[model samples]
Target: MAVNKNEYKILIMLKENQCTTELKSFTYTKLCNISKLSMSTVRRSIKKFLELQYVKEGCKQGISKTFYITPNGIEKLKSIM
Candidate 1:
């Protein structure tokens, strides 16, 4: 699958934030802040990642959905980097 700039940015963000647990949870707003992208852009990119199986939705809090990079995502990020 072809990785676009926003997708790349989000993936890198996810990789940078490594946690002891494999699932590193984050909101689209956080990703927007970190990646310097708009909320709509972050949301779109995250949805795309979900469709690609690069990221999966975790627990939901209030109106926000959490996300984490999958193994395939890590592999893709490693290869790209």
Candidate 2:
């Protein structure tokens, strides 16, 4: 699969924020602004990552969801780049 800049934004975002549990909750919509991508792309990126097993579901608080990159995440990206 071809990983675009949009996917990079979301995947790296996962690595950057795998250690947060602030009360505000880290949702995909928030990622929209951070990655400068629309809600659809952000949401879609996560959905695709979940299926591909690139990013792992690290922490969850019902609404507050956190994602972390696994070995495969970096593994593929390593060869992909």
Candidate 3:
């Protein structure tokens, strides 16, 4: 599938975050705040990432679902852009 600029932004952000684990538990609000994207836009990108299997469920705390990049995530991203 064709990935967009915003999705690229999100992935780059994840890469830049680089084992920090902050974004490992990031929510829509957190990604939005960091990326200056709307919540829905961030959600859409995240959904795409999940669909591509680039990112998967990382952790859960209470009502929140966190995400982490899979090995496939890295390779997919590398090939994408």
What TM-score, to 2 decimals, does candidate 1 have?
Answer: 0.75
- Alpha-carbon runs more than 4 Å astray in model 3: 1-3, 19-23, 58-61, 77-81
Which prediction has more favorable TM-score, 2 or 3? 3
Q: Clash pairs of candidate 3?
A: none
Candidates in order have lDDT scores of 0.70, 0.63, 0.69
- Model 3 scores what on Cα lDDT? 0.69
Order the candidate numbers by TM-score, best to worst.
1, 3, 2
Per-residue lDDT tens digits for candidate 1, residues 3-78, read 6664577777666766213456677777778788888988888777778887777765567667776777677767
Clashes of 2: 0
Candidate 2 per-residue C-alpha lDDT over 1-64 given as tens digits, one digit per residue, 9 for 90 to 100: 6667646777665455552322333466667777778988876787787788765564655756
The residue pairs found clashing in candidate 1 are: none
**Any idea how many clashes model 3 has?**
0
All candidates: TM-score: 0.75, 0.55, 0.67
